[PDB]
Structures are given as C-alpha cells and as structure tokens.
mmCIF file of C-alpha atoms in Angstrom:
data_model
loop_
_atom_site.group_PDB
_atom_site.id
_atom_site.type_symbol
_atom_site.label_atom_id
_atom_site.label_comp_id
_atom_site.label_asym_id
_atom_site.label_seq_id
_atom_site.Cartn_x
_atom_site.Cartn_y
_atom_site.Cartn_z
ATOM 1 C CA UNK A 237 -42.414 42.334 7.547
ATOM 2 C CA UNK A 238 -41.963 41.710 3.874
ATOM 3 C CA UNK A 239 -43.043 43.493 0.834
ATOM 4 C CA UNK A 240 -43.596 41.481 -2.071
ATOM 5 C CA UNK A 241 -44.879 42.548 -5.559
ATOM 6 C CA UNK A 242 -46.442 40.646 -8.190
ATOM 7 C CA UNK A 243 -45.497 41.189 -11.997
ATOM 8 C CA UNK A 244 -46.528 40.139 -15.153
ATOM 9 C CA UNK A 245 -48.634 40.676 -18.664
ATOM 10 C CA UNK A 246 -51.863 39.914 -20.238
ATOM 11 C CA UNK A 247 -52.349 36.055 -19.732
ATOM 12 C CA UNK A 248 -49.662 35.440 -17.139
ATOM 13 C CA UNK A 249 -52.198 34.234 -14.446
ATOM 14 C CA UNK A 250 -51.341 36.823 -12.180
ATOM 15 C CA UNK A 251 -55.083 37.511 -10.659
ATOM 16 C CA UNK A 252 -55.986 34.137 -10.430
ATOM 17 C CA UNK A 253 -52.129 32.801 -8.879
ATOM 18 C CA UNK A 254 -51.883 35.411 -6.470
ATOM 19 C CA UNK A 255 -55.487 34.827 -4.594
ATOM 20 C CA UNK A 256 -54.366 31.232 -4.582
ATOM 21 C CA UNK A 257 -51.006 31.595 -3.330
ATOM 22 C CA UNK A 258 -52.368 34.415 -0.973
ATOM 23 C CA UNK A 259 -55.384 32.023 0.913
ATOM 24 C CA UNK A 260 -52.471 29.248 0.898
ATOM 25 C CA UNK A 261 -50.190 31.995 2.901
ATOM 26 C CA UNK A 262 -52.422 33.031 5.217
ATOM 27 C CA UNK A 263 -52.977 29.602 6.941
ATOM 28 C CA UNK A 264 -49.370 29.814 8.192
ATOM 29 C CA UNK A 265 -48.121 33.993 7.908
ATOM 30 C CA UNK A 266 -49.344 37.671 9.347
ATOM 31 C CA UNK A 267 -50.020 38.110 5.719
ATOM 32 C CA UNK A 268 -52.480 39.962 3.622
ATOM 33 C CA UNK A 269 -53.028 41.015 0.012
ATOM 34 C CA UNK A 270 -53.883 44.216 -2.059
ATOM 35 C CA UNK A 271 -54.689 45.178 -5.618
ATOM 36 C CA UNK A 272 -53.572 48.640 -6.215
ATOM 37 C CA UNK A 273 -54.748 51.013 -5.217
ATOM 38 C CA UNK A 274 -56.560 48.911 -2.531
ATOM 39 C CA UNK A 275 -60.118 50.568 -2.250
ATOM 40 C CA UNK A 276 -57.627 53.761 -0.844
ATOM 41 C CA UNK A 277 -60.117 56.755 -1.857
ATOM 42 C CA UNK A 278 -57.700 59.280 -3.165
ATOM 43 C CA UNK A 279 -55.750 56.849 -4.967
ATOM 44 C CA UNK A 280 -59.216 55.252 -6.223
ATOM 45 C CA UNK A 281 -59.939 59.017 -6.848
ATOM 46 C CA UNK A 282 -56.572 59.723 -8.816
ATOM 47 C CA UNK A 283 -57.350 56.683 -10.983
ATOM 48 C CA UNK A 284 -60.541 57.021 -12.037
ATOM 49 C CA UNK A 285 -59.168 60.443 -13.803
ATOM 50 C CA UNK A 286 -57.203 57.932 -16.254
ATOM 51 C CA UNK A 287 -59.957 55.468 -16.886
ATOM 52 C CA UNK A 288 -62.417 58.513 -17.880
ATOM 53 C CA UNK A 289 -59.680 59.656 -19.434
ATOM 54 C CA UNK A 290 -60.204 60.690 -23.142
ATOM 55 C CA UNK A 291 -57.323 59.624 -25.548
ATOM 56 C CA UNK A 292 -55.517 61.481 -22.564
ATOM 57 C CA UNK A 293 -51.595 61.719 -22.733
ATOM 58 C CA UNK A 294 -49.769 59.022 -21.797
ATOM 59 C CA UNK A 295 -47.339 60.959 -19.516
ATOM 60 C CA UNK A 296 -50.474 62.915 -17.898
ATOM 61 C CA UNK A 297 -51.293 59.097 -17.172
ATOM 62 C CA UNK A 298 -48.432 57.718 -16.098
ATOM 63 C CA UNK A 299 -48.139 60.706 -13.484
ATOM 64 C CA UNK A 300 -51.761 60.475 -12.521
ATOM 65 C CA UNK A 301 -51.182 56.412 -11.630
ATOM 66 C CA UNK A 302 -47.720 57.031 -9.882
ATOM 67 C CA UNK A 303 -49.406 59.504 -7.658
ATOM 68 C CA UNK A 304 -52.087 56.751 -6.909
ATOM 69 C CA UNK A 305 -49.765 53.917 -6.128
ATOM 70 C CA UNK A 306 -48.370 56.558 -3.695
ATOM 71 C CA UNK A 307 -51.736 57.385 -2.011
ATOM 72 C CA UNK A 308 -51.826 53.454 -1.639
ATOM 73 C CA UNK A 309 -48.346 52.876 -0.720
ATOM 74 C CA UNK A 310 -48.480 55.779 2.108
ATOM 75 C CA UNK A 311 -52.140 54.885 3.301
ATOM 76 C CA UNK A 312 -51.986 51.029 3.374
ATOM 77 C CA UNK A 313 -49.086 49.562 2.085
ATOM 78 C CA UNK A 314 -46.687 51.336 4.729
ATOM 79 C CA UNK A 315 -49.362 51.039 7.932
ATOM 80 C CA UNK A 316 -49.729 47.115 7.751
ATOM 81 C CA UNK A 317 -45.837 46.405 6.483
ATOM 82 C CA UNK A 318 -45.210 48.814 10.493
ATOM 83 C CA UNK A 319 -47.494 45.919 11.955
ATOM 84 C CA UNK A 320 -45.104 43.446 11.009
ATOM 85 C CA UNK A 321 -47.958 41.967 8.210
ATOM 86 C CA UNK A 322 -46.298 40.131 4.738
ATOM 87 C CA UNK A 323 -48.058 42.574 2.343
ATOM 88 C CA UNK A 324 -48.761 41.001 -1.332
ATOM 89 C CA UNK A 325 -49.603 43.634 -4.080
ATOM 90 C CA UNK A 326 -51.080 43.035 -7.657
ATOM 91 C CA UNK A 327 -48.771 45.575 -9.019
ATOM 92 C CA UNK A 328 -45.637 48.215 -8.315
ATOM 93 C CA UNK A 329 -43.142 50.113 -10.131
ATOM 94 C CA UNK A 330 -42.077 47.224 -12.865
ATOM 95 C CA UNK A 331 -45.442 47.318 -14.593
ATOM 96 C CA UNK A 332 -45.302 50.792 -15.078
ATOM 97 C CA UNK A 333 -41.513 50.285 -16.407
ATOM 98 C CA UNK A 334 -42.954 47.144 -19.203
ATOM 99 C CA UNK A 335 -46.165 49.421 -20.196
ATOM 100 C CA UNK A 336 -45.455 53.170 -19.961
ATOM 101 C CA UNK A 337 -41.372 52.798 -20.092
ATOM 102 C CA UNK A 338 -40.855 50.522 -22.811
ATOM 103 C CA UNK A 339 -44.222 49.112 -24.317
ATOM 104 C CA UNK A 340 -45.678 52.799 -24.713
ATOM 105 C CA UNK A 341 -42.337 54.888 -25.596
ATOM 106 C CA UNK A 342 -42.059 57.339 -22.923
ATOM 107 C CA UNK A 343 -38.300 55.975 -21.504
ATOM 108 C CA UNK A 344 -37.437 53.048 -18.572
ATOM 109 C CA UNK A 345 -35.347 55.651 -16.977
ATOM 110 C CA UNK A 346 -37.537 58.224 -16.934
ATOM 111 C CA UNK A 347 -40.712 56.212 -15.721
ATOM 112 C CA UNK A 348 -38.036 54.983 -13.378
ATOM 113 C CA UNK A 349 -37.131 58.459 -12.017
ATOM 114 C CA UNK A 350 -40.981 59.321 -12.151
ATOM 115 C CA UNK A 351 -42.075 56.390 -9.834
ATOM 116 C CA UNK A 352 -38.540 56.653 -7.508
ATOM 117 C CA UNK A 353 -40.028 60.110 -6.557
ATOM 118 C CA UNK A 354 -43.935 58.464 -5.834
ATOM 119 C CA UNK A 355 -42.357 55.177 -3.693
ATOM 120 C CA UNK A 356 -39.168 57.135 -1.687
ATOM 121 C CA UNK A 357 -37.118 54.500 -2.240
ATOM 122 C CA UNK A 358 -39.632 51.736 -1.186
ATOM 123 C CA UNK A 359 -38.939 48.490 -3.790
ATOM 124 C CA UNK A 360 -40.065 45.581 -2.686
ATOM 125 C CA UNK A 361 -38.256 43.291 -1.131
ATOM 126 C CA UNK A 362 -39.336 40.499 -3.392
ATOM 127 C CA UNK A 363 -41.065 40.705 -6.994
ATOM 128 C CA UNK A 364 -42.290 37.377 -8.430
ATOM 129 C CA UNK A 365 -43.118 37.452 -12.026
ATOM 130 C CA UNK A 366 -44.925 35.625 -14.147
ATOM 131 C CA UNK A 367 -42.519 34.459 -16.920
ATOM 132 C CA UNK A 368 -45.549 33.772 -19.754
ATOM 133 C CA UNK A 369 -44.539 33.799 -23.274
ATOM 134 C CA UNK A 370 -46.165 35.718 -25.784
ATOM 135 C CA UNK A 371 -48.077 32.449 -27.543
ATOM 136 C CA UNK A 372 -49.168 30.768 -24.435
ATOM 137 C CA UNK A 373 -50.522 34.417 -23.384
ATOM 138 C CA UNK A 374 -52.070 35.198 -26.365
ATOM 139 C CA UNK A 375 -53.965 31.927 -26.146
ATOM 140 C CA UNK A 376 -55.375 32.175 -22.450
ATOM 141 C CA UNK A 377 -56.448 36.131 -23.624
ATOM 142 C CA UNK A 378 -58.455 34.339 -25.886
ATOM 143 C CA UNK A 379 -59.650 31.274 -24.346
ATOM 144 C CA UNK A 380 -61.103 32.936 -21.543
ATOM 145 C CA UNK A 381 -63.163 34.950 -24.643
ATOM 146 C CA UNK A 382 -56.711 42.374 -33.923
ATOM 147 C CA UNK A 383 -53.254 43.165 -34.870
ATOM 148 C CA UNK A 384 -52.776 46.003 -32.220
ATOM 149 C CA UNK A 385 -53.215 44.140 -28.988
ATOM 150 C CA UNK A 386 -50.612 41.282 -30.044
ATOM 151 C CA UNK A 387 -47.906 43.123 -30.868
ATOM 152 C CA UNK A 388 -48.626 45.603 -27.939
ATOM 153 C CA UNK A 389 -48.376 42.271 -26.208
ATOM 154 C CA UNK A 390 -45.437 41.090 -27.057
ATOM 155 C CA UNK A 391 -44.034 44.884 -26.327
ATOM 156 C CA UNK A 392 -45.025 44.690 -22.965
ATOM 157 C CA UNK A 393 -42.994 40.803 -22.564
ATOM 158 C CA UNK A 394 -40.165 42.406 -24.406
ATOM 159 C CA UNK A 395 -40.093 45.076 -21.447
ATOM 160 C CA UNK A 396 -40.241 42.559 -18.631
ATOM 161 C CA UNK A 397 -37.541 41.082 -20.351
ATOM 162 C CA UNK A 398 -35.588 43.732 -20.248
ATOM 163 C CA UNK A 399 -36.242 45.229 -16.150
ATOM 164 C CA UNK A 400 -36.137 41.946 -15.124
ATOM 165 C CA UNK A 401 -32.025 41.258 -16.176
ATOM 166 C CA UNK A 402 -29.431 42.471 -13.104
ATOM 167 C CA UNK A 403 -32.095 42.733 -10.839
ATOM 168 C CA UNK A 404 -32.138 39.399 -9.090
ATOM 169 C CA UNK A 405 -31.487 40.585 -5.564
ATOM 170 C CA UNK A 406 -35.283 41.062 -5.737
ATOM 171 C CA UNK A 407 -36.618 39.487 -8.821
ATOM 172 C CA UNK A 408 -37.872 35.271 -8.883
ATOM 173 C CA UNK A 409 -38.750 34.433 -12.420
ATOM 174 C CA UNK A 410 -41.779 31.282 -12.120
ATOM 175 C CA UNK A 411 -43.108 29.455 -15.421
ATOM 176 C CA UNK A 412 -46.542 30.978 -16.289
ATOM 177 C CA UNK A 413 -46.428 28.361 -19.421
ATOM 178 C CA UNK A 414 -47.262 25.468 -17.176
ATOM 179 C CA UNK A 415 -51.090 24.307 -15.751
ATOM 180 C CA UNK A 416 -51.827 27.641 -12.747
ATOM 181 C CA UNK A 417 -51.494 24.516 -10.387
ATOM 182 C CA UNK A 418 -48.066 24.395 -11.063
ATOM 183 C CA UNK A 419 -47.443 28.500 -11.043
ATOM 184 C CA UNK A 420 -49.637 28.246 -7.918
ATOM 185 C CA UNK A 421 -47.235 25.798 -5.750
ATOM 186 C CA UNK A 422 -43.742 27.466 -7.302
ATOM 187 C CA UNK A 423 -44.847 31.129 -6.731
ATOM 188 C CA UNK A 424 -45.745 29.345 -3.269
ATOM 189 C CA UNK A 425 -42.029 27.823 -2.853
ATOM 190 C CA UNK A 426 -40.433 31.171 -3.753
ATOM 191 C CA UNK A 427 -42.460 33.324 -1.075
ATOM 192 C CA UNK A 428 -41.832 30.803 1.759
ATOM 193 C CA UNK A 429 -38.311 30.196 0.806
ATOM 194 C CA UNK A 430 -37.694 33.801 0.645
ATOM 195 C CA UNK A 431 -39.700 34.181 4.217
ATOM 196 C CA UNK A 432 -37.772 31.293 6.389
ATOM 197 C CA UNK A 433 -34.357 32.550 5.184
ATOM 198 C CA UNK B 159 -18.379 44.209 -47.094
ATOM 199 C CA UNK B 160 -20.154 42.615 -44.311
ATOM 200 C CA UNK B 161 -19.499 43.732 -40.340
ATOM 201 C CA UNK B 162 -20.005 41.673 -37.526
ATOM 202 C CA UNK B 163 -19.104 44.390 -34.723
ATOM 203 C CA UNK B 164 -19.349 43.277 -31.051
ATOM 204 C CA UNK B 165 -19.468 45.920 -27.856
ATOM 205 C CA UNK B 166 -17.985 44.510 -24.333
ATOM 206 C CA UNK B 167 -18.070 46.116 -20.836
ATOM 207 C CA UNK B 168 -19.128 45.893 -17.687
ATOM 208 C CA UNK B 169 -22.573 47.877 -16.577
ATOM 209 C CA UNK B 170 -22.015 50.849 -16.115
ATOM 210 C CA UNK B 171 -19.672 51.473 -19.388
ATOM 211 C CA UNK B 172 -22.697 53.400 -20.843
ATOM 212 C CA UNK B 173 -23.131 50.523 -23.408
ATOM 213 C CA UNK B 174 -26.647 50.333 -23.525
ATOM 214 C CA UNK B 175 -26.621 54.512 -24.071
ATOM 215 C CA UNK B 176 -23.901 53.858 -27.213
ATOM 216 C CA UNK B 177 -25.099 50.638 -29.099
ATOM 217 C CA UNK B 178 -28.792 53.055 -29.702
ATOM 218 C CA UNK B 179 -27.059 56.531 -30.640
ATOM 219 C CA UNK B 180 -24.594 54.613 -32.814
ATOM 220 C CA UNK B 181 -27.529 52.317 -34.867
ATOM 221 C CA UNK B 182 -29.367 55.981 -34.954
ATOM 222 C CA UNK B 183 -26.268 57.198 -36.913
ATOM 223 C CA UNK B 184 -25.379 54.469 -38.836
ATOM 224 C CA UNK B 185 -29.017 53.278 -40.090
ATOM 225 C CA UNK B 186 -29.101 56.903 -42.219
ATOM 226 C CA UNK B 187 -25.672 55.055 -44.626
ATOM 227 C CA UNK B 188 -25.586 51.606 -44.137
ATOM 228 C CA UNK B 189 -28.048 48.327 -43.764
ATOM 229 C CA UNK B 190 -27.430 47.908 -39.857
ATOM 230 C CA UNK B 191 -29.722 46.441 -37.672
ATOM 231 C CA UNK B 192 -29.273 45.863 -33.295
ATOM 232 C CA UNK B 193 -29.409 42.725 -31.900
ATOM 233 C CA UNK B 194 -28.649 41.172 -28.144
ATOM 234 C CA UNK B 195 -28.655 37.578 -27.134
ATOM 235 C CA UNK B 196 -31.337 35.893 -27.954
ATOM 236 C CA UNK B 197 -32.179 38.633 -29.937
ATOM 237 C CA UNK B 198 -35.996 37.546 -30.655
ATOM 238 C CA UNK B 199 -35.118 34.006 -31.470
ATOM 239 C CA UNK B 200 -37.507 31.227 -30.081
ATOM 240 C CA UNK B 201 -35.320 28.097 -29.728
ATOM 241 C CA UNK B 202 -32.618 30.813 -28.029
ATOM 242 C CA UNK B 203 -35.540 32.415 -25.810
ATOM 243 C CA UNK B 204 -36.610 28.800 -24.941
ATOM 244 C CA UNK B 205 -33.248 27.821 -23.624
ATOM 245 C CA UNK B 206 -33.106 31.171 -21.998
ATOM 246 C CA UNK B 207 -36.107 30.816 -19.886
ATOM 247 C CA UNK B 208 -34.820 27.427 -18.319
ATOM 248 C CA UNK B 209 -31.652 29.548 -16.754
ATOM 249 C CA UNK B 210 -34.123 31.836 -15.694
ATOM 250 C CA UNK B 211 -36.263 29.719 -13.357
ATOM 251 C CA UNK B 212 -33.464 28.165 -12.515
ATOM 252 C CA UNK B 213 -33.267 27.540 -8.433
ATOM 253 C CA UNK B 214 -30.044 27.690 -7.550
ATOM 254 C CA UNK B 215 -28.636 25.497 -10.638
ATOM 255 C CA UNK B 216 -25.204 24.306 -11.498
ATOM 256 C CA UNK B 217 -22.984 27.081 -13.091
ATOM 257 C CA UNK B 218 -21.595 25.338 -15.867
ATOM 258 C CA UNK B 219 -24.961 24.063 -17.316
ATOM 259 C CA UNK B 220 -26.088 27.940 -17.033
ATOM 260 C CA UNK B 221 -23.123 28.198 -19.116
ATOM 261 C CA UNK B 222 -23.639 25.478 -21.629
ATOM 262 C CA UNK B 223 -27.183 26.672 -22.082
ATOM 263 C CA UNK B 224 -25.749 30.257 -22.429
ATOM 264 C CA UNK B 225 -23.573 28.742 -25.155
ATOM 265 C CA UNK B 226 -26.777 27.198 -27.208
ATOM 266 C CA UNK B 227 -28.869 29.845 -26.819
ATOM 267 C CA UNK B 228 -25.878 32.019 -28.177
ATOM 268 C CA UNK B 229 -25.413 30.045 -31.062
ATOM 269 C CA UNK B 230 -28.745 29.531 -31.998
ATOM 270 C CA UNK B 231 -28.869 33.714 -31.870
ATOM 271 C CA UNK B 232 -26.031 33.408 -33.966
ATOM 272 C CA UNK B 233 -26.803 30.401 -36.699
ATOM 273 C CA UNK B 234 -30.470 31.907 -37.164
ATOM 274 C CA UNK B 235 -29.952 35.452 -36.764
ATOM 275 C CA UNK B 236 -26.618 36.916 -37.127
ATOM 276 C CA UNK B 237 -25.277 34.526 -39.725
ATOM 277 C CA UNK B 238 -28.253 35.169 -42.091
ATOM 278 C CA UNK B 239 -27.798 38.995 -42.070
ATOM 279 C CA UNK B 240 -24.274 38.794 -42.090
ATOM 280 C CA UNK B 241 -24.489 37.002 -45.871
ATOM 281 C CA UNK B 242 -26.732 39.532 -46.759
ATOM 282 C CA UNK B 243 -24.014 42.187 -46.681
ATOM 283 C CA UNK B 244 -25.542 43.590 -42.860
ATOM 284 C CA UNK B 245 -24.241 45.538 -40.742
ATOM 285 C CA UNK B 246 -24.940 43.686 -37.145
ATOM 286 C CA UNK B 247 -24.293 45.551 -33.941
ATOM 287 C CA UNK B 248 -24.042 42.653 -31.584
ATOM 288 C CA UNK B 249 -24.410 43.505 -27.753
ATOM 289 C CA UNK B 250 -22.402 40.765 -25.509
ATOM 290 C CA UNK B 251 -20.830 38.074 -27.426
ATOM 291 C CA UNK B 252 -17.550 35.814 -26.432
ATOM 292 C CA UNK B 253 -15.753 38.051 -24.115
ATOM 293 C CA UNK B 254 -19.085 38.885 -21.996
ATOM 294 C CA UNK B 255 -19.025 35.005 -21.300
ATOM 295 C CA UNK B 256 -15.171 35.134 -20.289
ATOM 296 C CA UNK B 257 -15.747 38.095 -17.900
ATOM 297 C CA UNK B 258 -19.086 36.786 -15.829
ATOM 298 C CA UNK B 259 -18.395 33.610 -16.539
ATOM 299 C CA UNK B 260 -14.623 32.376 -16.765
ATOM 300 C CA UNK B 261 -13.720 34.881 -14.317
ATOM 301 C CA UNK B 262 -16.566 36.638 -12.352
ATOM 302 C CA UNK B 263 -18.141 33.409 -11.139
ATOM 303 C CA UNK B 264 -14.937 31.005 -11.113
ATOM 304 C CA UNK B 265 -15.265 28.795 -13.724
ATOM 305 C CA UNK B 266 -12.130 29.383 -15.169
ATOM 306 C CA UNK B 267 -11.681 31.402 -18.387
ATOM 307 C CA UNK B 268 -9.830 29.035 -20.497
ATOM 308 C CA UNK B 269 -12.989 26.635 -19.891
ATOM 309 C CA UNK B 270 -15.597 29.089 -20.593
ATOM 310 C CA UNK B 271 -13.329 29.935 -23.744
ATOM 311 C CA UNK B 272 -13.210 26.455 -24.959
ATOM 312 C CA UNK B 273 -16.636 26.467 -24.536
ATOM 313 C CA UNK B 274 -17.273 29.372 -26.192
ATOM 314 C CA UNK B 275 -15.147 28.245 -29.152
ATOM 315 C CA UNK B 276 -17.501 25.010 -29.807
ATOM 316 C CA UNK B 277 -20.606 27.378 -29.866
ATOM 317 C CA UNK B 278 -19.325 30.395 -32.162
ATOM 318 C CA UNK B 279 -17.677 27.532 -34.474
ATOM 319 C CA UNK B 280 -14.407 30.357 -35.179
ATOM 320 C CA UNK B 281 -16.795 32.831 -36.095
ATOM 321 C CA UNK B 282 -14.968 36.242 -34.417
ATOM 322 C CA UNK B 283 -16.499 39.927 -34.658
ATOM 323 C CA UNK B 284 -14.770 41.583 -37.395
ATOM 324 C CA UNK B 285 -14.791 44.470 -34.724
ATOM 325 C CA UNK B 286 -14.888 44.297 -30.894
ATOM 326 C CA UNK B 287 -15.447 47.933 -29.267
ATOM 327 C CA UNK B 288 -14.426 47.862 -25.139
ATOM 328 C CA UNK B 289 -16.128 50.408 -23.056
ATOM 329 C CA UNK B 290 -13.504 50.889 -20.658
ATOM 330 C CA UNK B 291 -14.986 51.944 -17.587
ATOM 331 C CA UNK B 292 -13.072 52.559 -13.988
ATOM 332 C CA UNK B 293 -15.014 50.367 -11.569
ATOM 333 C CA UNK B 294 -15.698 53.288 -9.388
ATOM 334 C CA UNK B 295 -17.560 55.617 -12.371
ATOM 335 C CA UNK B 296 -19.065 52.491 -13.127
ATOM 336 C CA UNK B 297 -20.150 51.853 -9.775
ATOM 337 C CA UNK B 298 -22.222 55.686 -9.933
ATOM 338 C CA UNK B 299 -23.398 55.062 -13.322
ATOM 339 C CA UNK B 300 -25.514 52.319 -11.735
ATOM 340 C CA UNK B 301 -27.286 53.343 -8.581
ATOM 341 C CA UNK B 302 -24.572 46.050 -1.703
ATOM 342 C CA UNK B 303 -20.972 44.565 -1.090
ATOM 343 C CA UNK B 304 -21.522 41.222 -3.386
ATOM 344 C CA UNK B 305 -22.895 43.211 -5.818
ATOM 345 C CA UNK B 306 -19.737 45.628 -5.871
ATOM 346 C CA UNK B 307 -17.538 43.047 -5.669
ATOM 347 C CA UNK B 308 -19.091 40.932 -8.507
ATOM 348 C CA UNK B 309 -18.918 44.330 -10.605
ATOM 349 C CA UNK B 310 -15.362 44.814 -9.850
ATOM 350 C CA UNK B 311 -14.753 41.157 -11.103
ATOM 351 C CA UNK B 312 -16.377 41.682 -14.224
ATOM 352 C CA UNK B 313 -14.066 44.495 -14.838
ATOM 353 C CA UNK B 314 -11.239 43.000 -13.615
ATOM 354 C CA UNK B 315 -12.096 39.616 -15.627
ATOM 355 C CA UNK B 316 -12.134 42.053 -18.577
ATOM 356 C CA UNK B 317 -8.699 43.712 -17.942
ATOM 357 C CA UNK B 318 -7.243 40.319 -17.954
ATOM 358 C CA UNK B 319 -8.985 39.653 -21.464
ATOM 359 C CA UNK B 320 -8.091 42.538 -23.525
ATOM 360 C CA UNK B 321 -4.377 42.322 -23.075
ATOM 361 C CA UNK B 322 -4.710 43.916 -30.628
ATOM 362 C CA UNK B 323 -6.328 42.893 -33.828
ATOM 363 C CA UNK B 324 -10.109 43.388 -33.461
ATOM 364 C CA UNK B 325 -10.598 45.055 -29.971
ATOM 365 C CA UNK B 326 -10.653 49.175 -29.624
ATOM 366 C CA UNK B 327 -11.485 50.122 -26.006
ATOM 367 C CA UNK B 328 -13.393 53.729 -25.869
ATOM 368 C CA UNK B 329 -13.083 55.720 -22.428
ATOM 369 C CA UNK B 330 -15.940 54.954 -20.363
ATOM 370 C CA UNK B 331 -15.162 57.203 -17.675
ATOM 371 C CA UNK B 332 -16.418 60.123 -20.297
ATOM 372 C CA UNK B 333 -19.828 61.708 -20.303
ATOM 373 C CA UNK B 334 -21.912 59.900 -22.333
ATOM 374 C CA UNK B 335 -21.914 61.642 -25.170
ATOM 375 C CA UNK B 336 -17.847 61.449 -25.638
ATOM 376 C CA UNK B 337 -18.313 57.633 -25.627
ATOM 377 C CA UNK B 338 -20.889 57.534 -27.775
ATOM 378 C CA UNK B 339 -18.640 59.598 -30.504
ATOM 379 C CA UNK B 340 -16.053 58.258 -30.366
ATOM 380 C CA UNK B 341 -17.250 54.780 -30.427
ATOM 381 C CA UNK B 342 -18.449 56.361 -33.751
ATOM 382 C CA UNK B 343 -15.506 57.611 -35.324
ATOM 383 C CA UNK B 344 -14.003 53.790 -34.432
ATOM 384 C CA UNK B 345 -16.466 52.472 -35.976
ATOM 385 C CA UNK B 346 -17.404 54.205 -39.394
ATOM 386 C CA UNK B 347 -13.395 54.297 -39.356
ATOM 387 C CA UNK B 348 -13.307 50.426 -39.893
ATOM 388 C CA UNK B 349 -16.447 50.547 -42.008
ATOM 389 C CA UNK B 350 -15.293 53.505 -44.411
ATOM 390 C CA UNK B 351 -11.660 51.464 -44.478
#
C-alpha cells in the first residue's frame, strides 16, 4: 500500500492531471483515487459548515476542515490503504500549510500542529506537486473564463515554496508550466518509479 | 553606511525564528528589508525550478545553477539595495554552499569555494552571524539515519569553516528567545559602531 497526495495552486492542473494519471494507474495497480473528503458524510457534513460559512474565522475554518480530512482519512483513506489499495488524494496537510499557514496568516507551525493532531502521524508517503508559476497560473485561471485573487495567488506559490524545501523524502516537484500531456506522463513516471522501488 | 549581514547554520539553529524577530526590531531604526535566495527574483526562480525537477541530476551542475541563481539574487536584488544605503538581512549565502555543498555532499569545499568566488565576484557580508547549534539540540529542534547523518555533516562542514573578521557565532543550543537577543545586540553592535 502507498499513500500518495497531490499538491498544488489555482491553475496547476491538479484536477484534470490526477484523473489522467489515475485511469493510466489503474490499468496496471490495486489503485484508486479520492477528492477530499470523498463523499464521507460527516466529513461532507463538517465541510459544508465552512462553505455556508459567513465571513467565518479563518481558524474556526481551518479546524472545521482538519476535522473533515480526519473523518475522511479514518473512514476511507485508512480502510482501502489496510487492503493493500495505492490510494491517490486531491489534497492533505500541505494545502492547508500554503493557504491557512502562510497565504492566510494564521502560522505553518501552528496549522502544522493543528493537522498533526487530525492525521496521527499519517503523511503520505509520496506528495507530487504541481510546480506552476504564478504567470502561467494566472493565465489558465483565466483562459478557462481583480487585484485580490493575484496576489493571494502568488501567496499561496510563495507557501508551497516554502513547505516544499527539506522535505524531499516525500516531496517530487513536476513542471505544471509545460502542455498537461507532459505533467500527465512525468507525474506518471514519479508514481511508478516511486511504486517499483 | 550600508550592511550586507549574512546568517549561517544548520536547521535546527533557530535561524528561521531569529532572521523575523531581528527585521521586527530593526525595521522600527533603520531601512532593512529580508531576503533568501532567490528572494522573488524571476531569472533566479527560473534557474531554481530546473534543480527542482531535477531526477536524480549531477551534483555539480545543481551547484553551478545554485551559483547563478545566487548571483542573479545578488546582482538584481541585494546589490541595488545595498547602494541605496539598505540594510539587507541575507538568509544563506557563501558558507551555506560550503557546508551542503563542499562538504555535506562531497564535492569538495575548496571547489564549491572557487565556485562560489566567480558568482559573488568578492562581494563578502560585511557581517556573517553563525547559529551555533550542537547537532543533537538541533536534531530535537526538527522533528531517519541519512537524514541525521546529512545534518551532522552540515554541522560538521560548518565547524571546519568558521575556524575572525566578519563571522560572530550566537549559541544555538539557547531557547529561542536568547538567540534571538543576542543575535541582536551583535548586530545593532556593528550597526551602531
């Protein structure tokens, strides 16, 4: 079994890349894929506190979603990683470091203790991420389609930037700048490498 | 009237911790600003992000690239702030390289210094502050055996380097808080003087 998280902002690909590389997987792995919190009710529950949330504090919030990636870690994730299965998730911990840690201003430390207490000390034991700079991002944001959301933007790169750095036991940086054909087939090359050895 | 001042040490020396509660003190006096490698700038992010999806690539041209990408941080951002009178709390410069590079990973320090010398083109930090952490507090501070072992290198790889004209070493082993002052007092010491 292998746990293996998917990681990046606002116009790195990451929805459409990890079907792809998941339906590629599957031909050859006991593999399956989730997006948090994975139709888990309570978690589902939990989370749709936030979204009806009302200019709701951003601690409040970043409790509220810690406690539903736990629902989903305990009442999915866990069950199918005992069954052996490769378990692909659209987010983990990281995220919550780049947008509530360091994009948002509540502390990476503290949003690090917060979500150590919701996973028990399960990190996964791969995180790809989707290494899209800040210009190529904006532009797919807005090909697919003010001042705020850019800088906010960049905030949240800036804080991938920053978890990312002596945390290469687990982390494989791809280029989210190229064609998704080409972040397709190397997000591919990492998983299987990191599978066969 | 200008200060290009430069914090070493492993992780684990509380760096991170001191280079914010020091700007915090000094921005209130003096025109300071924070910076780390590639500090923001795009031709040193570019080079950067090669390293970075690197897949198992040579050492040495990680280390050339570290040198470009350092001295485009330095040519486009430190230089310019330094002429206009700055203060610019640099974190990692030259002796960051020596540690994880010349010694850490094997390269060989005199290599990774002559290297180091092309990109930096003799420009030194006026001040050099060494958070002297023990391997074993430095080893807490952080929390696997290559891991460990590559952290005692960098230390180690550091020892060697600092054996007095621009380094000051504050003790790491500390709480936090004692580091942080009295990386203060060393510095507004040289700025004062």
């Amino acid at each position: 079994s292998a746990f293996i998280t998917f990681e990046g902002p606002e116009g790195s690909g990451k929805t459409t890349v990890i079907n792809e590389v998941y339906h590629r997987l599957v031909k050859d792995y006991d593999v399956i894929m989730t997006r948090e919190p994975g139709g888990v009710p309570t978690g589902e529950e939990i989370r749709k506190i936030v979204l009806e949330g009302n200019d709701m504090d951003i601690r409040t919030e970043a409790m509220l979603f810690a406690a539903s990636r736990r629902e989903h870690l305990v009442l999915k994730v866990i069950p199918a990683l005992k069954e052996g299965k490769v378990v692909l998730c659209d987010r983990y911990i990281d995220s919550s470091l780049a947008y509530q840690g360091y994009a948002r201003g509540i502390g990476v430390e503290e949003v690090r203790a917060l979500n150590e207490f919701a996973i028990n000390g399960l990190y996964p034991d791969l995180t790809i991420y989707l290494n899209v700079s800040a210009e190529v991002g904006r532009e797919r944001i807005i090909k697919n389609s003010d001042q705020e959301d850019l800088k906010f933007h960049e905030k949240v790169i800036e804080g991938y930037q920053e978890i990312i750095h002596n945390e290469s036991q687990r982390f494989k940086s791809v280029n989210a700048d190229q064609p998704l054909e080409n972040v397709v087939e190397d997000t591919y090359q990492t998983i299987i490498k990191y599978l066969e050895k």
